[PDB]
């Protein structure tokens, strides 16, 4: 199953907030894992365990005594989580789900001197490369791009624009490359 990182219990018009964040950083598969837990009061991170540091540390004065407590009680089992949570989730849960999720992008050229819009929508993962071509040649001047837009539903979208000279008999093409494709998508226009 999937595993969660433990929020460790500390010792003993207005609103108050506490936040526990457990963050697993994977680099090159599982060759390098970095575990970071954060304890946040309102918007203030006062206490942090960081696998690279190897123990809990107070971030603010507010966590002065919390660091020592969490080091006596929780140090050993927090370190072990890098393995029983981080590595276990990646290798046993992400690999056969998220890391396999491939959503092919939808490409749609539209018109709005003028402006050609290349809409690239509903793709996953995030890596993608979109280019404009005129006469087999790559356009560079007059290409604007949005930043990669995350939709929140596990797809992304991106919009690439080209200012052009509408000469009749000129053919503009939007070229799209993405890990989901065995061949790049090309879509043409007038």
């Amino acid at each position: 199953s999937r595993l969660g990182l433990w929020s460790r219990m500390d010792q003993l018009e207005r609103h108050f907030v506490h936040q526990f964040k457990g963050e697993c950083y994977f680099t090159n598969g599982t060759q390098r894992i970095r575990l970071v837990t954060r304890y946040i009061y309102n918007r203030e991170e006062y206490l942090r365990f960081d696998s690279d540091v190897g123990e809990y540390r107070a971030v603010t004065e507010l966590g002065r005594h919390s660091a020592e407590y969490y080091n006596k009680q929780y140090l050993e089992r927090t370190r072990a989580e890098l393995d029983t949570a981080c590595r276990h989730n990646y290798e046993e849960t992400e690999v056969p789900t998220s890391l396999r999720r491939l959503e092919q992008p939808n490409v749609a050229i539209s018109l709005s001197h003028n402006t050609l819009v290349c809409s690239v929508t509903d793709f996953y993962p995030a890596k993608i490369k979109v280019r404009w071509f005129r006469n087999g040649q790559e356009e560079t001047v007059g290409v604007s791009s949005t930043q990669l837009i995350r939709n929140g539903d596990w797809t992304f979208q991106v919009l690439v624009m080209l200012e052009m000279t509408p000469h009749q008999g000129e053919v503009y093409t939007c070229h799209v490359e993405h890990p989901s494709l065995k061949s790049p998508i090309t879509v043409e226009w007038r």
């Binding site: 969660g4 907030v17 697993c24 918007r43 949570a85 929140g152």
Partner: protein, 171 residues
Amino acid sequence: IEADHVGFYGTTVYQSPGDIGQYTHEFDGDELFYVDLDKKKTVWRLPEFGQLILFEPQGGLQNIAAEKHNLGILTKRSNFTPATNEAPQATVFPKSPVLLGQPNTLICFVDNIFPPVINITWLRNSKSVTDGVYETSFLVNRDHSFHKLSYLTFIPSDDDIYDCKVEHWGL
């Protein structure tokens, strides 16, 4: 921090008054699920999600309890320093290019939310709409404010005017 991938495994937020809790997981920046604290159920983001590999919701419940425990201790320790309300921003955008009589979804991205209590409503032609609406969990930001997305599924007609209105203590 740099990495090829990032798991958020056990993000918990607790809030008083009102005893308001939230437990979620997240991978590469997207929500995997949240645990429903009334039904004690794992609730996935997409219906394809908790089939092959599950998450037992009671572990979410424990993290919620510890965080309620931690909040009390910390509230008192700060001599009762209350949260500063922030001013959230809304930005709408379509999921795919809008065409007439073509099935689409409006997406409201609401950022700089703090504390995580908020109303996000859709208005078609100034009149409130609730048919066809989905709303994500409070999703974490690096600076410990939150963001949140609402989705309004819709039929594009001309003269149809949509807007995403936000109600927050910080406005």
